[PDB]
Amino acid sequence: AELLSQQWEAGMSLLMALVVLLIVAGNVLVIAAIGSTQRLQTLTNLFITSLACADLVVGLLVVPFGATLVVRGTWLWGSFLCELWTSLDVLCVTASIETLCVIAIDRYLAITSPFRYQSLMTRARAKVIICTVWAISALVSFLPIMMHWWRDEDPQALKCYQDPGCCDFVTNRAYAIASSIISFYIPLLIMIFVALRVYREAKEQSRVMLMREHKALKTLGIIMGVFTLCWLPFFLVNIVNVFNRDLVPDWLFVAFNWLGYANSAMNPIIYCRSPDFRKAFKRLLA
Ligand SMILES: CC(C)CCC[C@@H](C)[C@H]1CC[C@H]2[C@@H]3CC=C4C[C@@H](OC(=O)CCC(=O)O)CC[C@]4(C)[C@H]3CC[C@]12C
Ligand SMILES: CC(C)CCC[C@@H](C)[C@H]1CC[C@H]2[C@@H]3CC=C4C[C@@H](OC(=O)CCC(=O)O)CC[C@]4(C)[C@H]3CC[C@]12C
Numbered sequence: 470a471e472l473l474s475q476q477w478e479a480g481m482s483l484l485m486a487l488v489v490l491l492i493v494a495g496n497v498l499v500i501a502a503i504g505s506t507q508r509l510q511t512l513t514n515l516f517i518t519s520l521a522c523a524d525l526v527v528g529l530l531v532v533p534f535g536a537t538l539v540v541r542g543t544w545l546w547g548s549f550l551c552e553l554w555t556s557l558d559v560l561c562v563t564a565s566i567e568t569l570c571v572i573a574i575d576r577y578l579a580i581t582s583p584f585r586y587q588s589l590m591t592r593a594r595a596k597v598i599i600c601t602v603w604a605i606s607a608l609v610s611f612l613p614i615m616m617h618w619w620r621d622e623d624p625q626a627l628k629c630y631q632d633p634g635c636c637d638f639v640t641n642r643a644y645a646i647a648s649s650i651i652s653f654y655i656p657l658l659i660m661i662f663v664a665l666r667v668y669r670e671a672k673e674q675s676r677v678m679l680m681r682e683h684k685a686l687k688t689l690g691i692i693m694g695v696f697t698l699c700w701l702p703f704f705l706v707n708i709v710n711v712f713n714r715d716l717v718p719d720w721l722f723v724a725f726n727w728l729g730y731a732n733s734a735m736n737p738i739i740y741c742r743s744p745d746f747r748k749a750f751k752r753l754l755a
């Protein structure tokens with residue numbers, strides 16, 4: 470009884486601390502490696518840094534908070550922090566997929582208009598892109614949440630909003646679909662379309678130089694495909710719930726959300742296909 474709890478509490482607190490550590494280590498590495506290598510300060514990696522910041526925010530803030538909830542069984546941090554926690558969660562996924570769109574666009578341009586691309590893309594402009602992405606993302610995630618557009622009238626819903634120990638995120642059907650379409654599905658579709666255009670013009674192509682490039686593009690390809698596998702199952706279930714809560718077991722809907730959080734750990738590992746990243750990872754770790 471009370472032993473079964475202690476075992477679970479402490480073993481979970483461990484797995485959580487491990488994930489926290491892996492995300493936070495992995496992404497600090499990426500930021501520092503780009504931060505301390507002129508070789509690796511390309512325009513494209515500015516977008517990678519932005520992406521790794523998003524994952525960093527999942528490691529320091531999203532996952533710790535969510536861990537305390539999973540381990541201890543309730544929300545211990547009050548109303549305001551619960552909403553702000555939810556905000557940051559939605560914020561991160563949105564910035565992540567929007568940054569992936571920028572990256573696929575950056576690559577499409579650089580590959581079919583290398584001349585137009587050169588005279589257009591500068592450092593001051595890649596900064597503007599990155600902030601515009603974070604602004605759009607914060608707009609679409611904070612405001613509806615802090616304005617309670619996500620709330621429902623249900624008895625269950627109000628049971629939970631009054632209770633300070635509840636941080637369930639029970640939303641209405643409108644917010645569920647709007648949020649999914651605006652935060653995930655639309656950028657997901659843009660990023661697919663632009664990723665297959667990029668793959669067309671990739672095949673339709675000094676040989677050593679082109680192999681090294683296509684290695685980098687596949688890396689980016691993997692980045693995207695894995696982000697899509699980690700999140701697509703959750704946003705599919707998010708939708709289907711609105712029409713039928715009986716079609717998918719609750720535990721799996723929770724699982725799928727964690728799979729999402731887990732994606733924050735994967736990019737630094739995947740960037741180990743790069744010799745340049747790998748040399749900077751070792752040099753840094755001292
Ligand atoms: C409290 C929550 C909402 C988190 C707040 C996150 C933002 C304030 C962070 C996340 C991504 C960051 C950006 C990620 C990458 C860059 C690239 C970087 O480009 C450079 O001009 C210097 C890099 C170089 O040339 O070596 C400047 C900071 C900037 C715009 C960062 C500005 C601040 C951002 C938008
Ligand atoms: C809210 C959801 C439904 C929209 C998801 C779309 C975004 C992932 C992408 C699509 C096109 C992208 C835009 C493509 C081009 C630009 C111009 C870009 O470059 C500059 O403005 C620099 C020029 C300067 O120096 O002033 C700023 C970001 C922005 C709006 C990008 C922001 C992110 C956008 C809107």
Ligand SMILES: CCCCCCCCCC(=O)N(CCO)C[C@@H](O)[C@@H](O)[C@@H](O)[C@@H](O)CO
Pocket residue numbers: 596597600603604607
């Ligand atoms: C959750 C994130 C949400 C971001 C919050 C919105 C802020 C809007 C962006 C912004 O304030 N800037 C654009 C950022 O590019 C200002 C910068 O231009 C600033 O640094 C300037 O003072 C100098 O560039 C000029 O000397």
Ligand SMILES: CCCCCCCCCC(=O)N(CCO)C[C@@H](O)[C@@H](O)[C@@H](O)[C@@H](O)CO
Pocket residue numbers: 609613617618619620621622641642643644647648651
């Ligand atoms: C970018 C995110 C944008 C989401 C914005 C959607 C806001 C829609 C407003 C809304 O739907 N409600 C008001 C909340 O402001 C709640 C109602 O849906 C609900 O309370 C009842 O009418 C139920 O009985 C369902 O029919």
Ligand SMILES: CCCCCCCCCC(=O)N(CCO)C[C@@H](O)[C@@H](O)[C@@H](O)[C@@H](O)CO
Pocket residue numbers: 484488539723724725727728731
């Ligand atoms: C509210 C009750 C929720 C209780 C269940 C919480 C599950 C904890 C989530 C977690 O950390 N993982 C399970 C994820 O389902 C492990 C992941 O790190 C794992 O998926 C990845 O390591 C691999 O997929 C890739 O190597």
Ligand SMILES: CC(C)(C)NC[C@H](O)c1ccc(O)c(CO)c1
Pocket residue numbers: 555558559562637638644645648649652653707726729
């Ligand atoms: C329920 C909990 C843990 C806050 N998950 C939120 C989930 O990660 C999520 C992320 C992004 C989104 O756009 C939505 C929209 O329903 C939900």
Ligand code: NA
Pocket residue numbers: 548629630631632633634635636637
């Ligand atoms: Na509550």
